[PDB]
Paper text:
The primary receptor of the cholera toxin is the GM1 ganglioside, which is expressed in distinct membrane microdomains of small-intestinal epithelial cells. There are two major biotypes of V. cholerae, classical and El Tor, which produce cholera toxins with a slight sequence variation (cCT and ET CT). cCT and ET CT differ in only two residues of the B-subunit, His18/Tyr18 and Thr47/Ile47 (classical/El Tor).
Moreover, no previous toxin structure has been reported in complex with the blood group H determinant, which is characteristic of blood group O. The crystal structures of the cCTB and ET CTB complexes were determined to a resolution of 1.1 Å and 1.5 Å, respectively. While the electron density of the cCTB structure primarily supports orientation 2, most ET CTB binding sites exhibit the ligand in orientation 1. Since H-tetra-BGA is an almost symmetrical molecule, the fucosyl residues are indistinguishable. In general, the two structures are very similar, except that the N-acetyl group changes place in the two different orientations; the axial 4-OH group of Gal is mimicked by the α-anomer of GlcNAc. Galactose is presumably a remnant from the purification by D-Gal affinity chromatography.
Author numbering:
A (entry chain D), B (entry chain C), C (entry chain B), D (entry chain A), E (entry chain E): 1 to 103
């Protein structure tokens, strides 16, 4: 089991770490059918999604997808500094796998 | 996959973007039967619903509807600035499909 | 579809609007069997319940009942001003159907 | 239907009211098997639990037990004043049945 | 039933109490498949996980695992002082069983 986000991220293909060290600039949320997702941006233009749940996701990920959207909303609203995101870079926008906050 | 609320909104018929750049003026919530909904207003009188769940919604939308009501309540209580809403304009009041927050 | 609490409240028998324009004075919560409910008061002694879920409620109301208790707790803890309550006045204490928050 | 915590408490056997009029001093939470519970204390050493869900509970209490743990956590973090607890005094520590928050 | 985290912790094999008396320094969570988990650190380098749910857990632990991650996120965001953690020391990083918060 990994001890940090960087090591975690390295366990998977198709991923990378972004080091933001910044608060979330915007938070977008949709309930529209087939677009039940969240999008965040940072001041530098970096844009990330929490993907629409699909066949790329196993059943054990479903609660964690919902948690992640909860986390991004409250991080946005508290201006919490995001340290890193682990993302899948085979999606556009890049798709969030993990987040770390330290500040 | 869209990267922002404007492009997301354009994927659908009967939708329009409202650009508010303002906090929510009022938040209303009902548990009464057949009116299990939320209503928000802005100071300019713009009025929006989160629809009662119904046969227009697919299963994947049901958690998202609940999330959106959570988001609107906490946005209201934090006086968070709402940037845009994507709404269905074939409902009265207009029905929320997506929200963006930026400030 | 209604656009405000007053019009929503008027769709139901045995209801009334209370105009409070005040924060919640006390919040009570019970997990005791057959009394799984919330009670709120205002400074003037006005007392309201969220009813114990029962056969008077249709299935769609169940989630809305839980939401309303969440809303009352966070409204209490943020000292949010309650504008109006729509209540059923054939219950003692009067039972909450809807809430509006504004200044 | 009762209108306050005192009257509610008096509907049950083996209960008593504690009048605390104080914030929660400590909040403890366990996920250990058969000990999935919360424990609070006050500065005077008064110690209370939210019981592990068990055969003493009816099904309608299950959501309310979860809600109570939610309430205690946020009350602790907001330094909210606890007015009274209704507890079962046939449990060690005394088991929470209901809570009131006020000044 | 135990009355404090130390006594609870002692009911289990392979556990120990860490006394931190400090805020959480970093919070990490993941939605990646098979790593649906959270990791926290303290300034002294102490690193702890909330384990991925698995066959080592009983059903009552499922909700408690989700609660614990909720608690760690809000404790982080409120800078709440963590008093003690009860952890399993047969996992790397040590796995959280219980948390206490106090000053
Ligand atoms: C179009 C937009 O909204 N933003 C782009 C930004 O891309 C977005 O954010 C990235 C992280 C990714 O999720 C994209 O899918 C998304 O549209 C661009 O970022 C570059 O993205 C490419 C992938 O298109 C590579 O990943 C590259 O490393 C990224 O550029 C870096 O990150 C940027 C935020 C800047 O810091 C840039 O200087 C870096 O080179 C950028 C490219 O300028 O343009 C908009 O911001
Ligand atoms: C309670 C009320 O009557 N308020 C009106 C407002 O209507 C309400 O809000 C809109 C957004 C919609 O949901 C209505 O169903 C609801 O009653 C009026 O809004 C205009 O309505 C039309 C047709 O519905 C369009 O939606 C239009 O975009 C709305 O105007 C926009 O919002 C206004 C508040 C202005 O900022 C205007 O420039 C925008 O285009 C408006 C105007 O008639 O007046 C009250 O606010
Ligand atoms: C704890 C207490 O005795 N408070 C009373 C309040 O009664 C409570 O709150 C009302 C809304 C209801 O849920 C009652 O069952 C509950 O005990 C009194 O409110 C009046 O209550 C009588 C019934 O005993 C009638 O329901 C009457 O309509 C209520 O008054 C209206 O609402 C008040 C809060 C004010 O807006 C008043 O001007 C209204 O006419 C009130 C008033 O007697 O006194 C304490 O607050
Ligand atoms: C950790 C500890 O020993 N604290 C005690 C407290 O006991 C704890 O809190 C009470 C409410 C109950 O949940 C206990 O199981 C728990 O250990 C003591 O309270 C008394 O506890 C004894 C058992 O030792 C009896 O249960 C008794 O009823 C409790 O006293 C009542 O509650 C107190 C908080 C006071 O209001 C007292 O007047 C009440 O009768 C107290 C009492 O000495 O001391 C520490 O806080
Ligand atoms: C490597 C790193 O990131 N941190 C180490 C820390 O280990 C981490 O945290 C501990 C609690 C455990 O979860 C590890 O798996 C994890 O990598 C080290 O902590 C000691 O780790 C050993 C066995 O690895 C024991 O768990 C021991 O209790 C730990 O030491 C206690 O906690 C420390 C932070 C110190 O305060 C120490 O005095 C305590 O005994 C420490 C070694 O000090 O170093 C990094 O922080
Ligand atoms: O679990 C989610 C992930 O699934 C992978 O198969 C896919 O390559 C990633 O882009 C991401 O969607
Ligand atoms: O998914 C929800 C949407 O469903 C559409 O069919 C409908 O026209 C919209 O008004 C909205 O209700
Ligand atoms: O939805 C529940 C409501 O149902 C009505 O039939 C009843 O008269 C109200 O008091 C309220 O309980
Ligand atoms: O509903 C919970 C309560 O049920 C009672 O029967 C029991 O005596 C109490 O100690 C408490 O557990
Ligand atoms: O309940 C969770 C615990 O289960 C035990 O059997 C295991 O030894 C611990 O490491 C921990 O996983
Ligand atoms: Ca700021
Ligand atoms: Ca800080
Ligand atoms: Ca203000
Ligand atoms: Ca305000
Ligand atoms: Ca701000
Ligand atoms: Ca105040
Ligand atoms: Ca206060
Ligand atoms: Ca303080
Ligand atoms: Ca404090
Ligand atoms: Ca600080």
């Amino acid at each position: 089991t990994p001890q940090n986000i960087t090591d975690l991220c390295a366990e998977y293909h198709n991923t990378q770490i972004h080091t933001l060290n910044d608060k979330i600039f915007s938070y977008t949320e949709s309930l529209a059918g087939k677009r039940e997702m969240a999008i965040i941006t940072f001041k530098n233009g970096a844009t990330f999604q929490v993907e629409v749940p699909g066949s790329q996701h196993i059943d054990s990920q479903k609660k964690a997808i919902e948690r992640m959207k909860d986390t991004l909303r409250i991080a946005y609203l508290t201006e919490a500094k995001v340290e890193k995101l682990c993302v899948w870079n085979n999606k556009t926008p890049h798709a969030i796998a993990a987040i770390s906050m330290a500040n």
